[PDB]
């Protein structure tokens, strides 16, 4: 089969170390050679990112410039019909073929309520789920009924991600960081230092552009 490809989505407002460092460690932990970040927008009916689509795309390219592991796909930022993880992954499966292992990266917090921002059954049909560990969190769904789904799909063997196309859920022992885009925005507006929270090229860019004012 082909080389595993992982997909990493989100709004990245802005991208920061809490998003990047855990994922970078996957190259070492499970032999992941490629991660494609697919940033998205937020539907009009929900709180909007403070930085726009082009600013958030640029900050991600700044953060990713010197990291060969990463590439960026700007489709969800160009699509007019609402974005859905399952919709992205279905297009990916189509574009890559059924012979390519595919994985979606998520945090251990989101895993627990996965069926809520669902299409879960469809996602595990199209790709694997690579879960970035949250020290101290349990592997127990918010909805006690989905515990079965979760337990049937889990794997303790990283090799399954490389030998099958989709269907598995693996908890990677990635480092974790107490950093959040929301607090960084607040600190930037409060004039507090964010030097230890995201890449210098992104922070410098933020200042040049006068973002998060
Ligand atoms: Xe994605
Ligand atoms: Xe990232």
mmCIF file of C-alpha atoms and ligand atoms in Angstrom:
data_model
loop_
_atom_site.group_PDB
_atom_site.id
_atom_site.type_symbol
_atom_site.label_atom_id
_atom_site.label_comp_id
_atom_site.label_asym_id
_atom_site.label_seq_id
_atom_site.Cartn_x
_atom_site.Cartn_y
_atom_site.Cartn_z
ATOM 1 C CA UNK A 1 0.000 0.000 0.000
ATOM 2 C CA UNK A 2 1.103 3.665 -0.319
ATOM 3 C CA UNK A 3 2.620 6.040 2.265
ATOM 4 C CA UNK A 4 0.279 7.180 5.016
ATOM 5 C CA UNK A 5 -1.011 10.732 4.630
ATOM 6 C CA UNK A 6 -2.433 12.639 7.573
ATOM 7 C CA UNK A 7 -4.847 15.533 7.340
ATOM 8 C CA UNK A 8 -5.022 18.266 10.054
ATOM 9 C CA UNK A 9 -7.886 20.713 10.049
ATOM 10 C CA UNK A 10 -9.118 23.717 11.955
ATOM 11 C CA UNK A 11 -9.479 27.472 11.874
ATOM 12 C CA UNK A 12 -5.967 28.405 13.239
ATOM 13 C CA UNK A 13 -6.721 31.838 14.646
ATOM 14 C CA UNK A 14 -3.799 31.917 14.934
ATOM 15 C CA UNK A 15 -1.792 28.752 14.440
ATOM 16 C CA UNK A 16 0.382 28.198 17.527
ATOM 17 C CA UNK A 17 2.785 25.791 19.228
ATOM 18 C CA UNK A 18 -0.063 23.808 20.769
ATOM 19 C CA UNK A 19 -1.146 22.838 17.220
ATOM 20 C CA UNK A 20 2.360 22.312 15.743
ATOM 21 C CA UNK A 21 4.605 20.680 18.304
ATOM 22 C CA UNK A 22 2.434 17.691 19.091
ATOM 23 C CA UNK A 23 1.960 17.010 15.393
ATOM 24 C CA UNK A 24 5.655 17.410 14.531
ATOM 25 C CA UNK A 25 6.454 14.671 17.017
ATOM 26 C CA UNK A 26 4.354 12.224 14.892
ATOM 27 C CA UNK A 27 7.197 11.996 12.372
ATOM 28 C CA UNK A 28 9.237 10.413 15.144
ATOM 29 C CA UNK A 29 6.501 8.506 16.959
ATOM 30 C CA UNK A 30 4.691 6.719 14.129
ATOM 31 C CA UNK A 31 6.820 7.262 11.001
ATOM 32 C CA UNK A 32 4.459 9.818 9.533
ATOM 33 C CA UNK A 33 6.065 11.430 6.471
ATOM 34 C CA UNK A 34 3.393 13.868 5.442
ATOM 35 C CA UNK A 35 0.789 16.037 7.089
ATOM 36 C CA UNK A 36 -1.397 18.263 4.992
ATOM 37 C CA UNK A 37 -3.060 21.054 6.911
ATOM 38 C CA UNK A 38 -6.520 21.961 5.616
ATOM 39 C CA UNK A 39 -7.554 25.124 7.339
ATOM 40 C CA UNK A 40 -11.191 26.125 7.226
ATOM 41 C CA UNK A 41 -13.653 28.967 7.759
ATOM 42 C CA UNK A 42 -16.517 29.184 10.212
ATOM 43 C CA UNK A 43 -20.139 29.198 9.018
ATOM 44 C CA UNK A 44 -21.792 32.634 9.258
ATOM 45 C CA UNK A 45 -24.015 31.445 12.114
ATOM 46 C CA UNK A 46 -21.032 30.953 14.457
ATOM 47 C CA UNK A 47 -18.393 33.258 16.063
ATOM 48 C CA UNK A 48 -16.063 34.348 13.265
ATOM 49 C CA UNK A 49 -12.244 34.066 13.279
ATOM 50 C CA UNK A 50 -10.663 37.421 14.122
ATOM 51 C CA UNK A 51 -8.089 37.022 11.342
ATOM 52 C CA UNK A 52 -9.502 36.268 7.882
ATOM 53 C CA UNK A 53 -8.977 33.353 5.528
ATOM 54 C CA UNK A 54 -5.917 34.868 3.794
ATOM 55 C CA UNK A 55 -4.274 36.025 7.042
ATOM 56 C CA UNK A 56 -4.763 32.620 8.648
ATOM 57 C CA UNK A 57 -3.521 30.852 5.499
ATOM 58 C CA UNK A 58 -0.392 33.028 5.459
ATOM 59 C CA UNK A 59 0.389 32.564 9.156
ATOM 60 C CA UNK A 60 0.212 28.781 8.638
ATOM 61 C CA UNK A 61 2.626 28.961 5.646
ATOM 62 C CA UNK A 62 4.979 31.066 7.841
ATOM 63 C CA UNK A 63 4.810 28.435 10.623
ATOM 64 C CA UNK A 64 5.273 25.581 8.159
ATOM 65 C CA UNK A 65 7.993 27.059 5.887
ATOM 66 C CA UNK A 66 10.921 25.331 7.537
ATOM 67 C CA UNK A 67 9.083 22.082 8.390
ATOM 68 C CA UNK A 68 9.230 19.477 5.524
ATOM 69 C CA UNK A 69 6.656 17.361 7.326
ATOM 70 C CA UNK A 70 3.939 19.859 6.390
ATOM 71 C CA UNK A 71 2.127 21.036 3.322
ATOM 72 C CA UNK A 72 -1.058 23.167 3.085
ATOM 73 C CA UNK A 73 -4.219 22.545 1.027
ATOM 74 C CA UNK A 74 -6.380 25.669 0.625
ATOM 75 C CA UNK A 75 -9.610 24.075 -0.711
ATOM 76 C CA UNK A 76 -12.003 24.532 2.280
ATOM 77 C CA UNK A 77 -11.039 28.207 2.047
ATOM 78 C CA UNK A 78 -12.121 28.335 -1.577
ATOM 79 C CA UNK A 79 -15.238 26.136 -1.454
ATOM 80 C CA UNK A 80 -18.574 28.003 -1.438
ATOM 81 C CA UNK A 81 -20.739 25.159 -0.176
ATOM 82 C CA UNK A 82 -20.365 24.688 3.622
ATOM 83 C CA UNK A 83 -17.271 22.718 4.777
ATOM 84 C CA UNK A 84 -17.491 19.365 6.568
ATOM 85 C CA UNK A 85 -14.670 17.054 7.571
ATOM 86 C CA UNK A 86 -16.437 14.123 5.940
ATOM 87 C CA UNK A 87 -16.734 16.133 2.699
ATOM 88 C CA UNK A 88 -12.998 16.905 2.690
ATOM 89 C CA UNK A 89 -12.038 13.302 3.371
ATOM 90 C CA UNK A 90 -14.394 11.973 0.663
ATOM 91 C CA UNK A 91 -12.691 14.227 -1.869
ATOM 92 C CA UNK A 92 -9.314 13.065 -0.553
ATOM 93 C CA UNK A 93 -10.146 9.392 -0.876
ATOM 94 C CA UNK A 94 -11.262 10.092 -4.475
ATOM 95 C CA UNK A 95 -8.151 12.050 -5.380
ATOM 96 C CA UNK A 96 -5.737 9.595 -3.776
ATOM 97 C CA UNK A 97 -7.294 6.229 -4.543
ATOM 98 C CA UNK A 98 -8.317 3.363 -2.203
ATOM 99 C CA UNK A 99 -4.660 2.204 -1.914
ATOM 100 C CA UNK A 100 -3.497 5.169 0.168
ATOM 101 C CA UNK A 101 -3.703 5.063 3.966
ATOM 102 C CA UNK A 102 -5.401 8.256 5.134
ATOM 103 C CA UNK A 103 -5.634 9.779 8.643
ATOM 104 C CA UNK A 104 -7.392 12.746 10.205
ATOM 105 C CA UNK A 105 -5.616 14.285 13.224
ATOM 106 C CA UNK A 106 -7.628 15.436 16.260
ATOM 107 C CA UNK A 107 -7.082 16.224 19.942
ATOM 108 C CA UNK A 108 -8.086 13.788 22.686
ATOM 109 C CA UNK A 109 -10.708 16.371 23.828
ATOM 110 C CA UNK A 110 -12.542 16.298 20.485
ATOM 111 C CA UNK A 111 -12.403 12.536 20.289
ATOM 112 C CA UNK A 112 -14.714 12.274 23.307
ATOM 113 C CA UNK A 113 -17.529 14.217 21.582
ATOM 114 C CA UNK A 114 -16.674 13.010 18.060
ATOM 115 C CA UNK A 115 -20.223 11.844 17.178
ATOM 116 C CA UNK A 116 -21.560 15.380 17.892
ATOM 117 C CA UNK A 117 -19.583 17.207 15.185
ATOM 118 C CA UNK A 118 -20.150 13.878 13.446
ATOM 119 C CA UNK A 119 -20.160 11.944 10.202
ATOM 120 C CA UNK A 120 -17.934 9.639 12.230
ATOM 121 C CA UNK A 121 -19.035 6.425 10.636
ATOM 122 C CA UNK A 122 -18.269 7.938 7.225
ATOM 123 C CA UNK A 123 -14.901 9.266 8.396
ATOM 124 C CA UNK A 124 -13.692 5.930 9.730
ATOM 125 C CA UNK A 125 -14.810 4.461 6.344
ATOM 126 C CA UNK A 126 -12.544 6.919 4.516
ATOM 127 C CA UNK A 127 -9.670 7.403 6.962
ATOM 128 C CA UNK A 128 -8.061 6.622 10.285
ATOM 129 C CA UNK A 129 -8.226 8.842 13.305
ATOM 130 C CA UNK A 130 -4.868 9.821 14.876
ATOM 131 C CA UNK A 131 -5.481 11.187 18.346
ATOM 132 C CA UNK A 132 -3.066 13.563 20.049
ATOM 133 C CA UNK A 133 -2.994 12.663 23.714
ATOM 134 C CA UNK A 134 -4.202 14.967 26.474
ATOM 135 C CA UNK A 135 -2.292 13.922 29.669
ATOM 136 C CA UNK A 136 -4.764 12.753 32.293
ATOM 137 C CA UNK A 137 -7.850 12.554 30.055
ATOM 138 C CA UNK A 138 -9.851 9.306 29.837
ATOM 139 C CA UNK A 139 -10.840 7.290 26.760
ATOM 140 C CA UNK A 140 -14.543 7.601 27.610
ATOM 141 C CA UNK A 141 -17.134 9.225 25.378
ATOM 142 C CA UNK A 142 -19.354 12.059 26.559
ATOM 143 C CA UNK A 143 -22.294 9.886 25.338
ATOM 144 C CA UNK A 144 -22.037 6.530 27.139
ATOM 145 C CA UNK A 145 -23.590 4.753 24.098
ATOM 146 C CA UNK A 146 -20.735 5.607 21.706
ATOM 147 C CA UNK A 147 -18.227 3.975 24.022
ATOM 148 C CA UNK A 148 -18.760 0.813 21.954
ATOM 149 C CA UNK A 149 -17.931 2.493 18.662
ATOM 150 C CA UNK A 150 -14.805 3.984 20.199
ATOM 151 C CA UNK A 151 -13.645 0.720 21.765
ATOM 152 C CA UNK A 152 -14.177 -1.326 18.593
ATOM 153 C CA UNK A 153 -12.108 1.035 16.437
ATOM 154 C CA UNK A 154 -9.151 1.599 18.788
ATOM 155 C CA UNK A 155 -5.732 0.102 18.125
ATOM 156 C CA UNK A 156 -2.520 -0.027 20.155
ATOM 157 C CA UNK A 157 -0.484 -0.861 17.112
ATOM 158 C CA UNK A 158 0.766 2.118 15.001
ATOM 159 C CA UNK A 159 1.477 -0.327 12.169
ATOM 160 C CA UNK A 160 -2.275 -0.611 11.458
ATOM 161 C CA UNK A 161 -2.252 2.994 10.260
ATOM 162 C CA UNK A 162 0.336 2.031 7.608
ATOM 163 C CA UNK A 163 -1.170 -1.343 6.603
ATOM 164 C CA UNK A 164 -4.862 -0.467 6.148
ATOM 165 C CA UNK A 165 -6.484 2.513 4.278
ATOM 166 C CA UNK A 166 -8.929 3.645 6.989
ATOM 167 C CA UNK A 167 -10.951 2.420 9.973
ATOM 168 C CA UNK A 168 -8.629 2.642 13.007
ATOM 169 C CA UNK A 169 -8.291 5.006 15.997
ATOM 170 C CA UNK A 170 -4.843 5.319 17.565
ATOM 171 C CA UNK A 171 -3.849 7.404 20.650
ATOM 172 C CA UNK A 172 -0.371 8.814 20.026
ATOM 173 C CA UNK A 173 1.819 9.678 23.042
ATOM 174 C CA UNK A 174 2.406 13.182 21.758
ATOM 175 C CA UNK A 175 3.504 15.983 24.052
ATOM 176 C CA UNK A 176 0.707 18.342 25.080
ATOM 177 C CA UNK A 177 0.655 22.146 25.538
ATOM 178 C CA UNK A 178 -1.532 24.450 27.556
ATOM 179 C CA UNK A 179 -1.851 26.976 24.744
ATOM 180 C CA UNK A 180 -4.947 28.270 23.023
ATOM 181 C CA UNK A 181 -5.699 30.609 20.165
ATOM 182 C CA UNK A 182 -8.353 32.340 22.315
ATOM 183 C CA UNK A 183 -5.884 33.246 25.094
ATOM 184 C CA UNK A 184 -3.229 34.372 22.576
ATOM 185 C CA UNK A 185 -5.778 36.747 20.989
ATOM 186 C CA UNK A 186 -6.664 38.069 24.473
ATOM 187 C CA UNK A 187 -3.004 38.498 25.416
ATOM 188 C CA UNK A 188 -2.244 40.310 22.133
ATOM 189 C CA UNK A 189 -5.085 42.745 22.757
ATOM 190 C CA UNK A 190 -4.040 43.105 26.429
ATOM 191 C CA UNK A 191 -0.522 43.863 25.240
ATOM 192 C CA UNK A 192 0.851 40.801 27.081
ATOM 193 C CA UNK A 193 3.747 38.679 25.718
ATOM 194 C CA UNK A 194 3.032 35.668 23.484
ATOM 195 C CA UNK A 195 6.670 35.050 22.639
ATOM 196 C CA UNK A 196 6.586 31.544 24.110
ATOM 197 C CA UNK A 197 3.239 30.580 22.475
ATOM 198 C CA UNK A 198 3.767 30.504 18.698
ATOM 199 C CA UNK A 199 6.520 30.803 16.070
ATOM 200 C CA UNK A 200 8.439 34.057 15.798
ATOM 201 C CA UNK A 201 7.626 34.413 12.077
ATOM 202 C CA UNK A 202 3.926 34.258 12.871
ATOM 203 C CA UNK A 203 4.095 36.665 15.813
ATOM 204 C CA UNK A 204 6.254 39.123 13.862
ATOM 205 C CA UNK A 205 3.795 38.897 10.943
ATOM 206 C CA UNK A 206 0.890 39.546 13.317
ATOM 207 C CA UNK A 207 2.573 42.761 14.453
ATOM 208 C CA UNK A 208 3.507 43.888 10.903
ATOM 209 C CA UNK A 209 -0.044 43.386 9.748
ATOM 210 C CA UNK A 210 -1.522 44.804 12.952
ATOM 211 C CA UNK A 211 -3.645 41.690 13.565
ATOM 212 C CA UNK A 212 -5.704 40.899 16.662
ATOM 213 C CA UNK A 213 -5.904 44.558 17.515
HETATM 214 XE XE1 LIG B 1 -9.592 17.748 7.220
HETATM 215 XE XE1 LIG B 2 0.015 23.532 12.225
#
